[PDB]
């Protein structure tokens, strides 16, 4: 049963804005991220929109830009989540982020997208590990 269609939050600037906005709202509900942490995340909102504008104007990576956007966004979350902090864990925050993403999809459209969430989750892990293995004791 092929989808025969495509649905991505980066399809339009309006969608991305709504997704980011809704995402922040859900993140606030979790309380996993602090006020300062939220500010850093909200920053990616304007950065993404700006990048999309310039990227859209260009005639290169018409499709590759999709992966770049997902990686760039995920990278910001991975870096922010991968912080020392106190009484908190990156794993716990990672789970909370995934939950917020699902809610954002519904508010932005109204359909859960666990597949997309997993894709972002994987990117975060890659960025966190810096594309490198470890003892993992």
Q: At what angle do helices 64-81 and 114-128 cross, to 10 degrees?
A: 60
33 secondary structure, DSSP code: S
Q: What burial class does residue 116 get, using C-beta atoms within 10 Å of its C-beta: 0-12 exposed, 13-18 middle, 19+ buried?
A: middle
Method of determination used here: NMR
| Tokens (6 digits) for 99 | 């939950």
Per the CB < 8 A criterion, the answer to whether 16 and 104 are in contact is no
Q: Using CA atoms, how far apart are residues 36 and 51, in angstroms rounded to an integer?
A: 23
Q: By C-alpha distance, which of 92, 97, 89 is closest to 73?
A: 97
Q: What burial class does residue 109 get, using C-beta atoms within 10 Å of its C-beta: 0-12 exposed, 13-18 middle, 19+ buried?
A: middle
C-alpha R_g of the chain? 15
Q: Using CA atoms, how far apart are residues 101 and 103, in angstroms rounded to an integer?
A: 5
């Amino acid at each position: 049963g092929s989808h025969m269609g495509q649905n991505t939050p980066w399809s339009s600037t309006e969608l991305a804005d709504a997704f980011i906005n809704a995402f922040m709202n859900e993140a606030g509900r979790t309380g996993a991220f602090t006020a300062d942490q939220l500010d850093d995340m909200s920053t990616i909102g304007d950065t993404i929109k700006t990048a999309m504008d310039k990227m859209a104007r260009s005639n290169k990576s018409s499709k590759g830009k999709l992966q770049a956007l997902n990686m760039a966004f995920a990278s910001s979350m991975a870096e922010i989540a991968a912080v020392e902090q106190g009484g908190l864990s990156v794993d716990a925050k990672t789970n909370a982020i995934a939950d917020s993403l699902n809610s954002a999809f519904y508010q932005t459209t109204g359909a859960a997208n666990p597949q997309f969430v997993n894709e972002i989750r994987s990117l975060i892990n890659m960025f966190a590990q810096s594309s490198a293995n470890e003892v993992s004791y």
